[PDB]
Amino acid sequence: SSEESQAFQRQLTALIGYDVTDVSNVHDDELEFTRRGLVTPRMAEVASRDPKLYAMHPWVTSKPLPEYLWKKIANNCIFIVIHRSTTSQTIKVSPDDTPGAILQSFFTKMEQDFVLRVCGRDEYLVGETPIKNFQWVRHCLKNGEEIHVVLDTPPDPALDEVRKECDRKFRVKIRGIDIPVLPRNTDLTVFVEANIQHGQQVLCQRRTSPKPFTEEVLWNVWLEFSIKIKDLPKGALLNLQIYCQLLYYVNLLLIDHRFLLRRGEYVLHMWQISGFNADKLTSATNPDKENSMSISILLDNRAEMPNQLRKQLEAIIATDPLNPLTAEDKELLWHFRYESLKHPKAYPKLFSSVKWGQQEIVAKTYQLLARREVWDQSALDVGLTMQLLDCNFSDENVRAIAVQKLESLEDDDVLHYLLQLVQAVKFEPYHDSALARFLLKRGLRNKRIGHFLFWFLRSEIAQSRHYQQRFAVILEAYLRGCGTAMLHDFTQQVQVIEMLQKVTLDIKSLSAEKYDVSSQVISQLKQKLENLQNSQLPESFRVPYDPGLKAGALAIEKCKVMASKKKPLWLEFKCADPTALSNETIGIIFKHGDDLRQDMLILQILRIMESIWETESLDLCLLPYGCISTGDKIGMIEIVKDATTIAKIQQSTVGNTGAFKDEVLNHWLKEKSPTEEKFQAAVERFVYSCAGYCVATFVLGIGDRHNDNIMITETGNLFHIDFGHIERVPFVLTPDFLFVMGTSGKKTSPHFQKFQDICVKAYLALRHHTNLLIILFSMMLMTGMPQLTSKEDIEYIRDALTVGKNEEDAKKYFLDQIEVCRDKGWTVQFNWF
Numbered sequence: 001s002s003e004e005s006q007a008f009q010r011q012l013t014a015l016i017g018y019d020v021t022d023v024s025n026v027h028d029d030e031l032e033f034t035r036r037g038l039v040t041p042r043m044a045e046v047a048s049r050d051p052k053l054y055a056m057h058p059w060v061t062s063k064p065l066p067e068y069l070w071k072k073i074a075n076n077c078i079f080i081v082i083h084r085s086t087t088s089q090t091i092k093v094s095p096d097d098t099p100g101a102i103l104q105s106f107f108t109k110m111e112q113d114f115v116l117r118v119c120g121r122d123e124y125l126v127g128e129t130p131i132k133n134f135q136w137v138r139h140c141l142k143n144g145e146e147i148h149v150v151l152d153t154p155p156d157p158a159l160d161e162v163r164k165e166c167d168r169k170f171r172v173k174i175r176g177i178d179i180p181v182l183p184r185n186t187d188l189t190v191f192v193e194a195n196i197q198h199g200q201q202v203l204c205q206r207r208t209s210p211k212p213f214t215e216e217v218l219w220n221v222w223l224e225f226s227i228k229i230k231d232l233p234k235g236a237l238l239n240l241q242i243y244c245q246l247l248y249y250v251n252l253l254l255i256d257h258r259f260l261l262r263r264g265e266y267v268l269h270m271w272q273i274s275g276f277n278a279d280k281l282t283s284a285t286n287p288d289k290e291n292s293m294s295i296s297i298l299l300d301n302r303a304e305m306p307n308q309l310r311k312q313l314e315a316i317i318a319t320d321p322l323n324p325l326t327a328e329d330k331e332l333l334w335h336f337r338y339e340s341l342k343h344p345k346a347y348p349k350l351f352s353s354v355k356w357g358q359q360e361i362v363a364k365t366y367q368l369l370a371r372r373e374v375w376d377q378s379a380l381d382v383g384l385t386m387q388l389l390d391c392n393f394s395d396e397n398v399r400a401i402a403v404q405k406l407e408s409l410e411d412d413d414v415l416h417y418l419l420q421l422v423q424a425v426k427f428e429p430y431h432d433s434a435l436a437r438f439l440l441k442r443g444l445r446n447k448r449i450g451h452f453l454f455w456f457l458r459s460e461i462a463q464s465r466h467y468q469q470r471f472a473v474i475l476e477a478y479l480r481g482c483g484t485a486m487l488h489d490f491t492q493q494v495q496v497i498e499m500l501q502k503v504t505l506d507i508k509s510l511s512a513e514k515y516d517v518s519s520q521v522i523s524q525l526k527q528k529l530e531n532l533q534n535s536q537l538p539e540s541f542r543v544p545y546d547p548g549l550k551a552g553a554l555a556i557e558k559c560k561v562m563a564s565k566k567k568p569l570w571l572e573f574k575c576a577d578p579t580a581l582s583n584e585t586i587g588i589i590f591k592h593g594d595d596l597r598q599d600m601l602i603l604q605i606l607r608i609m610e611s612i613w614e615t616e617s618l619d620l621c622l623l624p625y626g627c628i629s630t631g632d633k634i635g636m637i638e639i640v641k642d643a644t645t646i647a648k649i650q651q652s653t654v655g656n657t658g659a660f661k662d663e664v665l666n667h668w669l670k671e672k673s674p675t676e677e678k679f680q681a682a683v684e685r686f687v688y689s690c691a692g693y694c695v696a697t698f699v700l701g702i703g704d705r706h707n708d709n710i711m712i713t714e715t716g717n718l719f720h721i722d723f724g725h726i727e728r729v730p731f732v733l734t735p736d737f738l739f740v741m742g743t744s745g746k747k748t749s750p751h752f753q754k755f756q757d758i759c760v761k762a763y764l765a766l767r768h769h770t771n772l773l774i775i776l777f778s779m780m781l782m783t784g785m786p787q788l789t790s791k792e793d794i795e796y797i798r799d800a801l802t803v804g805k806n807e808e809d810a811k812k813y814f815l816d817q818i819e820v821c822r823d824k825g826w827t828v829q830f831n832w833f
């Protein structure tokens, strides 16, 4: 430790937003043991990575180029437009043409160190991929637009340079509980419930005598459990809870990171229930020693299946993730564990049929996992892998075969799944996990991944006390290997975000909950932005939410505070790239008031749904806008260009306190389209994007939305906003949407029939991926909600995806829902005030 060493570590702390060397809220070694453990995987990935592919991070896919999109290539021909200083020049090109081939199919069209970069962006077309297999290229095809690439020097890889670095039964003594003040109620009773717990399966449970609820309550009882010390499984948690009814909980790992039984005296500060949630499982103690309840404790311690059994089995094995097993189901899985091993899809259920509190069963479990050829030969099924990483599996061997599968994800697919894999770190018993390290590896290997990993981790560190220490240790590890270049770049973004976040807080307080932005507010705002430009603010920052774009200077006069109780800022920037082919603006909405973690989670489910749709050649035209959560009820949102809310459209030549008429959306649509062509391209886009959002939202159960929360672009693209947030309609298909499709008001249309057609296609696309959608929704709820039912809330999607139907029963169902919305026209829209 020099200065040096510590100098650098001070930078890290501000990048993270947490001090990982602080050891004042720990009662053991684990965290520091993870900092040192993560050194090896990091270095291995630094040492092993390609310097120039790392510096240029092509964003590519191995996936087939969809039916739509080929249908946008005419004569096996793709036009690319190079640029050198003031010169341009197109180049006709073939789908399979590697960027190296294209570059010389240009030098022959009349040295080595020139790269095919994108205009506007830190985005290279490089490495050995058919151009059609770069994502920027596919963005340009889907979107009707031309590919523009500058010709310049390949970024110096030197900038990315990484810095030099017993058969006794188990018992617990419950000494007592202490809390500086209760005043919440007068009196009542309290007991401590101590649960021995594995994969949220309670192994044993004892409680204390009840006693009067006073500021200090002492017991001081040995609670003897039914289980032997030797049958405690690794990852087993002492769960300690205070009831009246549940008020407080905390957990202690019975077995530690060094495989030793937790021995000794503990005073543990607890988390308060504020009224099935990832938070409940944390091995972290509450850092607030002042206001917190504490508890103190001492630890002193080959055959042939009856054709119809086999079909019993296969029916169990073919049932959904949320289908409960019975004692019988479990005994059948376990008894026929080797038969079950032949089915990859049985793995979750088979592992839930294990008695984890028996050492000899656990051992037999390990013996069957040594026999892992069927699993290792199986194609990655992400949904099934995801299930083994959720709250029901606390065993490291089980969780580690799940991660093993994830190893073959391409980078493109990591990115689809990144937020939910970061969130899944919360179901890990230990800080250092095969999952922790896979995310670490994948981040260091790819800058795009590594950038989102930063903000994903940072979002949790800034607002999860339960989980911020774990996530900070993993973030530090990332940061000590991403390169001083990336480090430089994160520092800047944090700098800007902090600056811009003060301004949105300051400005909010100034405005009352009254629907008016006062002269002197927009005055106050314009002021700070100048008083900040113009100080203060970096010459240019990378847009988080979109790491290719770089923002430069604000456009003070386009900036404003938004017609919302939340008073978000609407900021606009000049794009610091001269080579950019527009002068369109980079818009970021900063907002305090909403939990944008919920938005993130939903938005990422929606990108996934679009990939599901792509595999079956459907484009439902979602606009899943960028949205980075930054701290407690605060963060950033992407401004969609030429977009207007659907409430604002209705409050037209009409006006305010009334009333909703069925055209207007159509007029606005023609009003906005320069040619009757463009109009029709818009009505088309509307039928698709409409369909996508009705399926998506019905499945996620977030369909009943008010139309100030539904937007549309000038080109017909519908999109829901503010997921926020939190008589029944299944989705928002109002008369004004129908008109545009062309069916006032109980008939059929060429375009309604199409809409109905597209919904049915896309719905059925999703149910093919039913098990994947269900695990995502279930983790979503556990790691990003208020409270959620370990039956009914999660089970919504089961019923939405119409599990255990044929394609017929389902098409019916969805067309039924389409109707409910038509039968109710404007009811629920009006029902708002």
Ligand SMILES: CNC(=O)c1nc(-c2ccc(Cl)c(S(=O)(=O)Nc3cccc(F)c3F)c2)cnc1N
Pocket (backbone or CB within 6 Å): 562, 563, 564, 568, 589, 591, 625, 637, 638, 639, 640, 641, 643, 644, 645, 708, 709, 721, 722, 723
């Ligand atoms: C009026 N809003 C817009 O024009 C707009 N809104 C968004 C947007 C997307 C998601 C969310 Cl969650 C939001 S917001 O609810 O936080 N901001 C907002 C502020 C004033 C009025 C609104 F209707 C808003 F949605 C806004 C994106 N691009 C846009 N062009």
